[PDB]
Structures are given as C-alpha cells and as structure tokens.
C-alpha cells in the first residue's frame, strides 16, 4: 500500500485574490543547503528574490548567482557509494518559484528525484510525512503552495496554543499553593517550520520499499528552506497571545 | 565556592584605537550541544542592537532567529529545550565596543564572561553568571579588555627568559562572550562544560579582534 | 623515489567573464573544517593567509581567532607556528604564486607541480621553504590538460559500451553524466599544510591527518572545466541489440 507515490510527466487573475501579505519580499526566496548522508557538504546556497529559477546539479562552476553546481564540492568523508550517485545528478533539477510563493520542480537529470513535501502528502490523501513522492525525469510539477501552506500554519497553530491552555488547566489540579503556570513560548515552532521546509534525494529513494528509511541515509540530498513561507509563519507566531503568567488559583 | 553568580534585574573618552571600525561588530555562532547550527551571523557595525530569539524569519540584519534551524542529529532534550528560548535575548554595542546583554526571554540566561569573572571576584573563566529575565548589563568592557590582553601578552613574552607563556588562542577568548540559553552549566548542574548545553551561541567582538591583532604584531610571541 | 619534492628560496582562454571571485578558501583541522569559507574578490589578486585574529577579513585571512571545540593541544600547538603564514597571488588569468612568509615552510598539493617535477598525478609532496616564491598553478597548463582528460574519459565510457555489447536487444544501455567529474575538478584544486608535513617520510599518510590546512577552489579554472563538461556529447541511450 503506496507510501512511495510515483509522479510521471504529464505533457500540457491573481488580481481577484490580494497577496498572503503586506509584508515585504524577502531578498532570497530560498536557501538550500547539500547533504551527504547526515554531513553537511558546502556552504548554504541562498537565492535572491530576482532570480525565481535555480538549477542544481553535478557540475562545477562555482559563480554561483542562479545555479549551484555540487560536482566540485569536497568531502572528506565521502565513501565509494556517494561518489556513485554522485555520478548520476547530470543536469539534476530545477526549482521555480511562481505567484507569491509556489514553487514547482522539473527534473532534468536523467534519474529520478525523491521528494518530502507536505503539499504532495496532502495531494495524495496521505498523512504528513507519511509518504516520499517520486518525481520521473523530465517531470514538472508542483510541490509546494503558499495559500495551502499560510491556511495550515493558521489552523496548526491555533491547535497548539488551545492544547497549551488544556495541559495548563489539567495540572492546576490539586487544591492549594502559591504556583503559576505559564506557557512555553514557542509551541509547535519546530513542527510549523517543517510545513516551509522542502527536502529531495537525487537517484535515491528512501522508505519502507527502500534500504534507507531517512534522507539522512541517502547519498545526496538538499534540504530548501522557502523564506516567504518562514516570514508569514513568523508573522503567525507574533499575532499569539503574550505567555502572561498564571495564578493557579 | 559561589561558582554560578546571580544578576537580577535593577530598574534604574576618545577612540582606544584609530584603526577603521569594523563592518561587523560582531559574529554569532549557533551551538547545539558540540554542533554547530546553521552559517554564523554577522552584525553590521550599523545595527548597533540585534536579537537572537528563538522565532522563524530567516532575514538577516538586526534578528538572528533559531528557530527555523535544521540539525540532523537534534534531540528531544535540545527540541524540548529551545521551546523556551522565546523572545531570546539582545545584544548591544556601547560606544567603541563595550557590550550589554538584555533577557527578553521568559527563562534565565548564562553568560560566560571575562569582564564579569573580574567583577565577581573569581579566577578568570572559573564563574558562570545566572541573567535572569527583563536583566539589563554590562557584559563587556572594551577598554578593560585591551589593558589586558597588552599586559597578558606583555608578559608572555617576557616569560620567554626561562605556560607563563600563553598563546594566540588564550589571548583571543578575551575577545569572545558565550551564552547558554534555558540550561545553565557547572558544579551545580548535570553539565560541567557550555558545550554539554542544548542550545548555546558564542559571540565573536571584532573591535576587540582588531585590537588583539594589533598588539600581537607589536609584541610578538 | 622523491615524493617529497624541496622548493627552497631561489590572449585569454575564454570570452566567459571573470568570476566575482579568484578562488574560495577552506580552513581545516585534521578531518573537521573549522570557521566559514572564505571567498576572494578577483578586486584583490593577492590574499593573506595567516595564524593571526583580524577578523576584518577582505583580503586577509586570519586562523587564530576561529573556535574548535574539537581542538586539541596538537592542534593549538602547530597553530602557534603559522605566524606570518603564506601569501597566494593571482597573476593573468589565473595562475597562481605562493610565497611562504611563515618561519616553518609549508607543504603543498599541486598537480601541475607533480606535472614539472615528473611524478605522477598527485603523488608528490611540494615543500616551500621560508621565503620561497613558487608558481603552483598555471591556467593554459590546466586547461590543456582538462581538454585531453575528458576527451579519454568519454573514449572510455564509450569503450566500456561495446563491452557490455559483447554480452539482447530489449535493453537499452547508457553512461553516466557524470564520469571524470571527480577526477577533473582536483586538477583545479590546491591543498596545503602548514607546519607539518604528510607522506612516506612521515607519521602522517594524508593531508587529512595534519593539524591545520586549507583548500583552495580556483575560479577561473573551475568556469573553464564548466564549459568543457558542457561540450561533451550528450548521453543517448544505445539499445543493445
């Protein structure tokens, strides 16, 4: 039963609904940052606001700007096994950011790319993160959606600072002393975060069908955090009501 | 012997050097546990405050958020403990370099610190000190800290007509503060070095690196 | 057997425009790489590499105020030594010159060095001595050299394809995009130690093993190897028939 979700290539009045946000652009729409295995290789890869497409693969030019080449970069810890995968990006892959925030993927490399994408699960009917969605080469399609996004991050967050106030009443149960309670600031934040956080393994995939049941456990993967999906839920944070200290009493 | 000290809040000369200001006046490093976190954060001499708090947007200038921060060998203890990092802390720069720390956080703040080693009364780095929040201070004097890296230094290279001789990496963390947030360290607690705490920053002062430079070039080691 | 090798004191390739940077530099410490890399302006052709704390950075790269909470008393140790370190200058379009300024010399990884001193590829040790003022790099030799290595690796990868012809036709075979990538990019890579030193004549089989090197990314280099890899012949399944 699917948990692998296979994505093949499929051939072929935003002035109606105002924009997530007053608030202005950022100056990077995303940064990503390469992986080998659970090792960190290069520095963080950040993409200016005016360049809406960026192309990652195995080659080596260094300029960076629009394209960040992972074929010149070191690591010396890297085994015989992520030098064979290293081999197969190729072209690798392309992120475009459209509308607001959207960003849609096109696979470029002659192999396939496994995404992590809450947008794709919920796509699917499947829970989040319970599936890793197979992108086939030559393949478009669009893995994440600020509207979606914004509307989750609202609901999800509303749901913690109410599971807050639960916990908070359930222990006021004694009586009785002189204790108050108050609410750790910052619910959820690390599970929000996730919801602007896209993550891609190239070649391989991972999973129950797989040997490999993290992207940690892959030879090379990405990690793209999407600034304007970071600001909004920053915005989100700040509309919560102020950790106000609390008499249990 | 009082190895943590305890800072409650209180409610209330010319350039040292002539040697360009920097363009930072400071580089943060985000620690969680021995690892580090995230790129290091450089402070434009021109946002003489930033606030490293524990929220989301990932834009640079005056705000250092760690809250967005992806660590592949995170655990529950550091998750559990950035859940009180909050409104985190502010750093501000005082005329030439000096420093101050204020707790906006809504748990305490550790801070390890030469010029509040030599306020307290303790041997250099043998002292921990507790901010607590809404806390306000001093946590660096520029000019102390030259008067004694010149003469740290000065008899360093006076203990070469035989240890007394110390070198670069000693004189350079009087240039550097550190900070825990939520978990303090020492005798008192489960942890007896920064580097076993959750989540940890240490701060670099470039107008205080300058300084060093200069002096290691005229008294050589 | 010489693989250490003793150096004591003694029209452009492309339209491409010139990088933002000559080259990017990468500090580390045994096998952990300490402090951010460091990326040169082609506005400054000659940059500093040394052991002491201006944090200024620019065109001067100084170690000894980056943190190592993995550091030992080794480690510390060969710090002490770097002092004036070395100086990497960019002449033309891309070579680059070394000149040892620290009081301990400094050893070097260098294919066109083990290319003049008739080793082979990579297997030398160049050891600049105090003062010394050596090329260690030269773009046309490079060049050159990239051109006729990625020309025998396709032959290869091709050769290697009527050879699992020589086994059915209900099966197409393809060669990787990326073959001699990883060879190719070392030819625009320098490496060196300070302090200490690595190989058979010493404790240390590996530049990974001493206490303190960088790695230098040569730019221009690293664009032509870019455009080399892009006028290779795309790869079209051939069915094996």
């Not at 030019?61 to 081999?87: K, M, W």
């Not at 009443?169 to 750790?184: C, H, K, R, T």
């Amino acid at each position: 039963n699917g948990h692998l979700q296979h994505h093949p290539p499929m051939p072929p009045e935003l002035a109606f609904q105002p924009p997530i946000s007053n608030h202005p652009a950022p100056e990077y729409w995303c940064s990503i940052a390469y992986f080998e295995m659970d090792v960190q290789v290069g520095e963080t890869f950040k993409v200016p606001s005016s360049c809406p497409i960026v192309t990652v693969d195995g080659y080596v030019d260094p300029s960076g700007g629009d394209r960040f080449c992972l074929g010149q970069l070191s690591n010396v810890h890297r085994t015989e096994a992520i030098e064979r995968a290293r081999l197969h990006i190729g072209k690798g892959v392309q992120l475009e950011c459209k509308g607001e925030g959207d960003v849609w993927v096109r696979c470029l490399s002659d192999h396939a790319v496994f995404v992590q994408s809450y947008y794709l699960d919920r796509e699917a009917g499947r829970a989040p993160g319970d599936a890793v969605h197979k992108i086939y080469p030559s393949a478009y399609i669009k893995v994440f959606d600020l509207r979606q996004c914004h509307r989750q991050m609202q609901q999800q967050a509303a749901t913690a600072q109410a599971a807050a106030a639960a916990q908070a009443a359930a222990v006021a149960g004694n009586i009785a002393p002189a204790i108050s309670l108050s609410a750790a600031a910052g619910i959820g934040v690390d599970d929000l975060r996730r919801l602007c956080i896209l993550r891609m393994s190239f070649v391989k995939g991972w999973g129950p069908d797989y040997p490999r049941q993290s992207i940690k456990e892959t030879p090379c993967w990405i990690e793209i955090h999407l600034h304007r999906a970071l600001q909004l839920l920053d915005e989100v944070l700040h509309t919560m009501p102020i950790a106000d200290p609390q008499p249990l009493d």
